[PDB]
Ligand binder design. Structure first.
Ligand SMILES: CS(=O)(=O)NCCc1ccc(F)cc1
Ligand SMILES: CS(=O)(=O)NCCc1ccc(F)cc1
Ligand SMILES: [Cl-]
Ligand SMILES: [Cl-]
Ligand SMILES: [Cl-]
Ligand SMILES: [Cl-]
Ligand SMILES: [Mn+2]
Length: 340
């Protein structure tokens, strides 16, 4: 039977089921005020699916010059055509290869660049912005988005949205690598999964995805969406409460020292965006510092709401297209204030 919502992550994660319901705010706002992330399912059913295909991006924009990142070793591939990324998104035999002869796991850096999404892609901009959940919070001019209303005493987000495109991580060794390393943002954000590409070539790669979700500490209800409903899983997130950010800095300064890094005692390993918390480091955070987090699997059409100041990391299970909008809720405006 159809329901307004469910509770995931041992009752700590709200999952809203109807992305456009005019009553969603009544369920959302108490979870949000407590500094929790929120998930909203079903946004893909509201969008024009033809606008969000990898082959369309290659056809329309493929002669633009871009830089790529090799997710395995952080090497930068400079000044290549964006078609060289898009044409290997789902077809493994078309992917750029490393010196060892293997196909690379690539991330497309800063594309569209800076604030240019709306100018470059006006039909995509309209389709996303008109279908964002919790629109009083997430639209540029929503009544509960303070972004356009604050003075210079507050850090204001850039004009959005921003697109995040990267291949899926594949191997047992890849389990310890991030798509996006641990970091935080001083603004709130909503991140929508608009497309998931499950390949052919090395295709039949299902078992390493299940071990990644299990070892990732997914809850048993999330482990049912995999097996029961046959939805496409895109990415595994870990999110930590803003109140636990300094305890995470203390762990990563200790581990940096154990690994012979030579950092000053006040340096900021979260701002550096250089760490991915693997199973070993997540268990040490829990056991040695008493800090737990939310393990979230983002399926096609899921919107993840990330509270301002909350440390988070992302690991793609399959090839993903994500689109994110930043906003400034009144609940979390303290995190962007420039004094005290
Ligand atoms: C430019 S590179 O990143 O150093 N790679 C070496 C070139 C290559 C690697 C694998 C091939 F199947 C063909 C050529
Ligand atoms: C591993 S999980 O299935 O995501 N459940 C964790 C929920 C939780 C989140 C944050 C906390 F500070 C304490 C508990
Ligand atoms: Cl907060
Ligand atoms: Cl467009
Ligand atoms: Cl709303
Ligand atoms: Cl990163
Ligand atoms: Mn972020």
């Amino acid at each position: 039977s159809m329901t307004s919502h469910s509770w995931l992550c041992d009752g700590r994660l709200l999952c809203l089921h109807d992305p456009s319901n005019k009553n969603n705010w009544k369920i959302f706002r108490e979870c949000w005020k407590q500094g929790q992330p929120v998930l909203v399912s079903g946004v893909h059913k509201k969008l024009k699916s033809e606008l969000w295909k990898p082959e369309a991006f290659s056809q329309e924009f493929g002669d633009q010059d871009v830089d790529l990142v090799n997710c395995r070793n952080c090497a930068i591939i400079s000044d290549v055509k964006v078609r060289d990324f898009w044409d290997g998104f789902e077809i493994i035999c078309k992917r750029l290869r490393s010196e060892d002869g293997q196909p690379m796991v690539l991330k497309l850096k800063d594309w569209p660049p800076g604030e240019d999404f709306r100018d470059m892609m006006p039909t995509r901009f309209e389709d996303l912005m008109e279908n964002l959940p919790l629109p009083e919070y997430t639209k540029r001019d929503g009544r509960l988005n303070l972004a356009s209303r604050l003075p210079s005493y507050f850090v204001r987000p850039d004009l959005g949205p921003k697109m995040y495109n990267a291949y899926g991580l594949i191997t047992a060794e890849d389990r310890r690598v991030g798509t996006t390393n641990l970091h935080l943002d001083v603004s709130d954000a909503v991140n929508v999964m608009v497309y998931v590409g499950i390949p052919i070539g090395e295709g039949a790669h299902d078992e390493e995805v299940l071990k990644t979700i299990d070892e990732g500490d997914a809850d048993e209800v999330t482990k049912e969406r995999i097996h029961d409903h046959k939805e496409k899983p895109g990415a595994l997130w870990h999110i930590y409460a803003a109140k636990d950010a300094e305890k995470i800095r203390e762990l990563l300064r200790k581990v940096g020292e154990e690994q012979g890094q030579e950092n000053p005692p006040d340096h900021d390993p979260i701002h550096d965006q250089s760490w991915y918390l693997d199973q070993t480091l997540r268990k040490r955070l829990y056991e040695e510092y008493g800090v737990q987090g939310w393990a979230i699997v983002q399926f096609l059409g899921d919107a993840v709401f990330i509270p301002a100041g909350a440390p988070h990391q992302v690991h793609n299970l399959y090839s993903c297209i994500k689109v994110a909008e930043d906003f400034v809720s009144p609940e979390h405006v303290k995190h962007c204030f420039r004094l005290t």
